[PDB]
């Protein structure tokens, strides 16, 4: 069906906005603290402390199957990210800090993005 169709195209939209996004979100962490999932061979206890690991290899590899339905699915794990890093470690920590800064980096093009996504629907 040509509805059908339409939703699709809507979708590959946002996909493509939400590409862009990521890329601008990834570019706030130059040090790839959060690019690749953490390593349980080398965090062994990791999932006794975070349920829901996340990180941007896994938000492309969702967003490539175009499995961010709307811009508060991504927002959620992005949020993930953020909140698991802030929670295993401890304040005076290099990976805490990133987080940090990539929370207010962030906050910034999600802030934009929100608006070109209502803007464009």
Same mark, same amino acid.
């Given at each position: 069906? &040509? /509805?059908?169709?339409? &939703? /699709? *195209?809507?979708?590959? /939209? *946002? ?6 996004? $990521? ?6 962490? =130059?040090?790839? %603290?959060?690019?690749? =999932?953490?390593?349980? !061979?080398?965090? =062994? ?5 975070? !349920?829901? =690991? &996340?990180?941007?290899?896994? &938000?492309? !590899?969702?967003? @490539?199957?175009?499995?961010? !339905?709307? $811009?508060?699915?991504? @927002? ?5 990210? %953020? ?25 910034? +093009? ?5 608006? /070109? +996504?209502?803007? %464009?629907?």
């Amino acid at each position: 069906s &040509m /509805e059908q169709v339409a &939703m /699709e *195209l809507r979708l590959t /939209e *946002l996909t493509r906005l939400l590409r862009s996004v $990521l890329d601008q979100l990834q570019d706030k962490d =130059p040090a790839r %603290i959060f690019a690749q =999932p953490v390593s349980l !061979k080398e965090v =062994p206890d990791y999932l006794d402390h975070i !349920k829901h =690991p &996340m990180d941007f290899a896994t &938000m492309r !590899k969702r967003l @490539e199957a175009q499995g961010y !339905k709307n $811009l508060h699915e991504f @927002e959620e794990d992005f949020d993930l990210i %953020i909140d698991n890093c802030m929670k295993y470690n401890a304040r005076d920590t290099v990976f805490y800090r990133a987080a940090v800064r990539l929370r207010d980096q962030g906050g910034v +093009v999600l802030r934009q993005a929100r608006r /070109e +996504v209502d803007s %464009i629907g």
